[PDB]
bis(5'-nucleosyl)-tetraphosphatase (symmetrical) (Streptococcus pneumoniae serotype 4), 388 residues
Amino acid sequence: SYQDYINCSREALLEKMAELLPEKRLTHCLGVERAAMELAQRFGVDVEKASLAGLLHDYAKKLSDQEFLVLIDRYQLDPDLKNWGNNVWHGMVGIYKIQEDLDLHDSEILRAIEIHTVGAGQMTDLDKVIYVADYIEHNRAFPGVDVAREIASLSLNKAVAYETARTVEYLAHQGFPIYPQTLETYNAFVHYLK
Amino acid sequence: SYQDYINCSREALLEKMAELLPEKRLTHCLGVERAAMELAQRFGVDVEKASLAGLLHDYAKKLSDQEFLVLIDRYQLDPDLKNWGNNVWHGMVGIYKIQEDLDLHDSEILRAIEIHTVGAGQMTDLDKVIYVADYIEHNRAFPGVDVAREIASLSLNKAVAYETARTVEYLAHQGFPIYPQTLETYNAFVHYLK
Ligand SMILES: Nc1ncnc2c1ncn2[C@@H]1O[C@H](COP(=O)(O)OP(=O)(O)O)[C@@H](O)[C@H]1O
Ligand SMILES: Nc1ncnc2c1ncn2[C@@H]1O[C@H](COP(=O)(O)OP(=O)(O)O)[C@@H](O)[C@H]1O
Ligand SMILES: [Fe+3]
Ligand SMILES: [Fe+3]
Ligand SMILES: [Fe+3]
Ligand SMILES: [Fe+3]
Ligand SMILES: [Mg+2]
Ligand SMILES: [Mg+2]
């Protein structure tokens, strides 16, 4: 059960998250919970760790900028983080808020949430499951989500590669700064597209 | 004259380059020579340094992989360079071949050739002139070259930003590895697109 890892039941967690997140975001989290379970079944990842991490991945999505900056200082995180924003922070810094609120200390779950946006050059299968589940959950409808879904039915590594390539492409298309850890993921995984 | 910087005349250089490069590549170099001159006039860069750097920028385009690897060892360059290929090498390593062949020692010209492919987080105006001239020279016909040309008539920094964004976008589109120095350029310049 979820209380093996956190300080309340799944039902109680959902009630708390319903106060912190808008409806669309909570529905997304429920979508990622389900998608993570299915991917974990497929690729030999603990289904419970994957479901919980999937549900929690966007827990800190709505923390204010000031709250993140306070967390960066309190936990003495990389000071370069202050140069970025919510996209980077909600996972990479938000894990500390999740830890404070829910008493979450499992290192594997924490890491999977931490890098769910930007990935890393080295990812555990659990990391990969969350990173992919986020992109392919059933509420997502962006063009090419069908391709990502097909890829994820066959290869976890190729799905990471595909998602990361599309994200780099889209950020450059839009003219948004690209957090360097994303490129580390991109270069580590791009060979799987062949 | 060019012999203020190298060990032969422009005419003599062109004869030597005609043996090293296929016709299309030499025509490109002549195009960059002209484009660099015009941009340098516009943005307060020495027109002679810009023209010479423009002509020379792709001098080492046709060196073999083995030749580059030998240069990496002989000059004790970053050993990570061995992980890449001609795209990265012909500028970043090719400068040493240019130096050996032509007795080119001018630091500004050498730097502009060195980073003409990947850029850097900090670029001199001469660096920027070469990086842009390469992309907009009159023989180039890729879709959107017209946009790059318009931008380059108004702002050197915006032209660097635009070129770098399109390159990152296209590399990710194609599923090619992205040399990390390119992202350093991208993140440093992307704000000029606004
Ligand atoms: N390296 C990066 N730099 C900046 N933004 C990024 C980077 N990688 C992803 N993003 C963006 O961060 C936002 C949040 O992404 P993510 O956490 O994956 O999804 P969600 O929207 O469900 O939280 C997206 O708009 C995405 O494009
Ligand atoms: N960071 C990078 N990693 C890999 N290839 C790159 C990078 N930046 C540019 N390139 C590619 O290197 C090739 C050579 O580019 P460049 O030297 O700018 O033009 P030219 O073809 O005239 O020599 C191009 O195909 C370009 O897309
Ligand atoms: Fe997220
Ligand atoms: Fe999400
Ligand atoms: Fe080149
Ligand atoms: Fe060129
Ligand atoms: Mg993701
Ligand atoms: Mg260039």
Summary: The interface with chain A takes residues 161, 165-166, 168-169, 172-173, 175-178, 180, 183, 186-187, 190, 193-194 of chain B (CB under 8 Å). DSSP finds eleven helices and no strands in chain B. The pocket of fe (iii) ion (ligand 3) is lined by residues A 57-58, 90-91, 116-117 (CB under 6 Å). The longest helix of chain B spans residues 23-43.
